[PDB]
Curated annotation (Swiss-Prot), chain B:
InterPro entries in alphabetical order: PAB1135-like (IPR002739), Ribosomal_uL5_dom_sf (IPR022803)
Record lineage: Archaea, Methanobacteriati, Methanobacteriota, Thermococci, Thermococcales
Superkingdom of origin: Archaea
Family to which the UniProt record says this protein belongs: Belongs to the UPF0201 family.
Entry protein name: UPF0201 protein PH1010
Amino acid sequence: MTMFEEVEVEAYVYPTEDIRKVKKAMLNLIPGLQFEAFDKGEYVILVGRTKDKRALQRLYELFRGQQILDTARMMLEEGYFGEEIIIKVHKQVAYVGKVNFNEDSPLGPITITIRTKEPQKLMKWLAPRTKDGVPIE
Amino acid sequence: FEEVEVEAYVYPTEDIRKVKKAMLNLIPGLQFEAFDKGEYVILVGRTKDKRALQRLYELFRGQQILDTARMMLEEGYFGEEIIIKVHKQVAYVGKVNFNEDSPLGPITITIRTKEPQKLMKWLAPRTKDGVPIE
């Protein structure tokens, strides 16, 4: 059964940007998003949402294959408040399909918000603490 | 002036044609070269046309920003070179904004001129409450 209620991904789309390319960057990280877009004049807010229990599978895989479980876990923990876990990733690196937590993204990070009633279990499943691949928690 | 050169980065989520549009909104008649740097492309435009600064001349006056423009030209000035940085997204809609936290980097305009004092005085005369004092 599901480990989260919903995933919401948010990014700003600037006038010199392509809304389609920003949608692609978001889907690279969380597949199957349903988009709404909101006009703010100086940019558009793109919001992606999914309640699909398999929505975190791409992150699960990228954290492991990039070998960034330690950084991923630190970022999840920093973003953990109440019933939400929020991370911010590099927009341009997401467009080429990887995760980068460097907060200095040509303009605007992509923000990923995970709404969950079991955040300790989510974080331990998504970004386990390991030593040479061996569980240390 | 002898030349106007204009530079901007094009990031992967950007459309090069939109960045070109923004540059041309500010300095018409530019010829471009593009340089791939991987994480972004560098776009560089150029023109020697003597009407190359009329849009800026006009926009500085129309937007009533003669004070900020002169201050930015002076800050950017030495010798035969005046460099200013303008907001890319505002340039895309056709205006000048000298606020430098520009989404996806600024557009950098270089004016090359043998007579930069005459240049600054003509383009953005010193003003008091908007009223030119020279």
